[PDB]
Amino acid sequence: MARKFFVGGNWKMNGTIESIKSLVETLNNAELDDNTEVVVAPPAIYLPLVRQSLRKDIQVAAQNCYTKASGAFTGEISAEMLKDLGIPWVILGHSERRQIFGESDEFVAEKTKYALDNGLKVILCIGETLEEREAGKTMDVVTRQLKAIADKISESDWSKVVIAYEPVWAIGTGKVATPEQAQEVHAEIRKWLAENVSAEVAESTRIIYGGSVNGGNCKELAKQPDIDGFLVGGASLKPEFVDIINARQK
Amino acid sequence: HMARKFFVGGNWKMNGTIESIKSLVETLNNAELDDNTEVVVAPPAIYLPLVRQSLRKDIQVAAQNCYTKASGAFTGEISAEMLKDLGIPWVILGHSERRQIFGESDEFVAEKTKYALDNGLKVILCIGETLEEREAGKTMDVVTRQLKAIADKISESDWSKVVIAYEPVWAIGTGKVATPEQAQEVHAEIRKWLAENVSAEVAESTRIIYGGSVNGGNCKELAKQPDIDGFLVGGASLKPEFVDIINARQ
């Protein structure tokens, strides 16, 4: 419904000045679908290098931020620092921070509200484990994760949010969700947004899919009506990222 | 202090913008600093390139944290190879805020420490007890257990690239600095532990620095104690008096 196709690339903990320059040069020479909104997320120490050298139509995302303006939080980055460097986006609630670093639903919610209130746009990650899906709890998990943010941010705040549904069993495993599998979750998420936030927020909020998206499976995924794009991990380090940006082309 | 070079680190924590950092750096670049003092400053990761390129080269730069692996799917983490790739020779590990807020275990800090040392970094390793552990007579048990976790993993020659920062948690940011006698008593216990558990040579040559409400008004009396080899400075490292602390022995 007029939702602009969105492809994010999460580089995670990967890259050197040399390999990043090469990845940036590949993107700077690429032929990109004019209708795709593209964001890439480098490790924090390379945000200046990428932001200074990357084509300006591709915006830069941080991979995390904290909940406060400044203070005694060794090793944390604040939203104000991102704004200071010209970084407009931040990924929050990624599965690796929820599991490895124990980030709670409320912690992600606090981060999301702080980011939005201070000038950033948010890629908000949600997703169930294999055990939660096997237990029949997929929707219970992803709606509880979303509900923590919905209770904290205004209806207007959602215009600056992209939702990333990334089932944990699909992340890095090579087990991509099937188009039907992804479609049925995004439809249920959008339905949840209609009853709990508003019908307009449901209609305009991009819900992107992440988890083993690559050049060979992205075209079929992109045809599903409630899938508005991708959050791409392993493939965002490779030239194939360009084909995923161009997944709505024939 | 047994030919141990005096060492002053500034941990900027989650503070700074390009503008405030330029001013901070200009104050240091113009300052008269004791040549007998080793000086290290730790900006947030997003400003490591800005600081590393504009700061006088007799002051070294540190990251405030790093992860345990060379690369991989660890959204929001920085590796030791990225620090080496950026020319950042130090890293602070085990800081209380990471232990308490972010839940870093003794073993996790130890894994980071060994990985960082193995890949060419030098480590400021933070240890220290809370108010409540001290109220139960556990100061020595706590700080030696935090230390033993690193000792169990690193070799004797690795200690030449380690500085120990004793920062009692009740003194961090609270304005309740350790008295010279309180701090000296713990530092002597730490050096004793090193002599009994590693080697006499490691005990004699390892800098044990003190952190916790150090400022220009209390650094000189603290620096007179025989087993205090310098300071890890928090809030005052953002201020001109950081120079006074660098010159605490002159």
Q: Which of B111, B129, B167, B187 is catalytic?
A: B167
Whether A22 is covered by a domain: the verdict is: no
Look at residue B173 and tell me if it is in a domain. yes
Would residue A19 count as lying in a domain?
no
CB-based contact A16 B82, cutoff 8 Å: yes
Q: Domain of A54: which CATH number?
A: 3.20.20.70
3-class secondary-structure state, position A230: strand
Taking 3-state DSSP, the helix, strand and coil percentages for chain B, each rounded to the nearest 5, stand at 45, 15, 40
Is residue A29 one of the residues assigned to a domain?
no
Please give the backbone phi and psi of residue B218, each rounded to the nearest 5 degrees, phi first.
-115, 0
Header resolution in angstroms: 2.1
Structural domains counted in chain B: 1
| DSSP state string for A108-177 | HHHHHHHHHHTT-EEEEEE---HHHHHTT-HHHHHHHHHHHHHTTS-TGGGGGEEEEE--GGGSSSS-PP
Report the SS3 class of residue A71. strand
Quick check: B118 and B83 in contact, CB under 8 A? no
Gap between the Cα atoms of A122 and A128, Å rounded: 20
- What is the full DSSP assignment across A193-225? HHHHT-HHHHHH--EEEESS--TTTHHHHHHST
Contacts of B151 (CB under 8 A, 6+ apart): B197, B198
Q: Is residue B1 part of a domain?
A: no
Considering only CA atoms, give the Rg of chain A: 17
β-strand partners of B40: B9, B60
Domain interval for residue B115: 6-246
- Chain B CB contacts of A76 below 8 Å: 14, 44
Nearest CA in chain A to B12: A74
* Method of determination used here: X-ray
Q: Does B41 fall in a domain?
A: yes
Distance of alpha carbon B108 from alpha carbon B20, whole angstroms = 33
Q: Are strands A59-62 and A37-41 parallel, antiparallel or unpaired?
A: parallel
Among B38, B95, B97, B104, the one annotated catalytic: B95
Tokens of A18: 């040399």
> Looking at the domain assignment, is residue B126 inside a domain?
yes
Is residue A246 included in any domain, yes or no? no
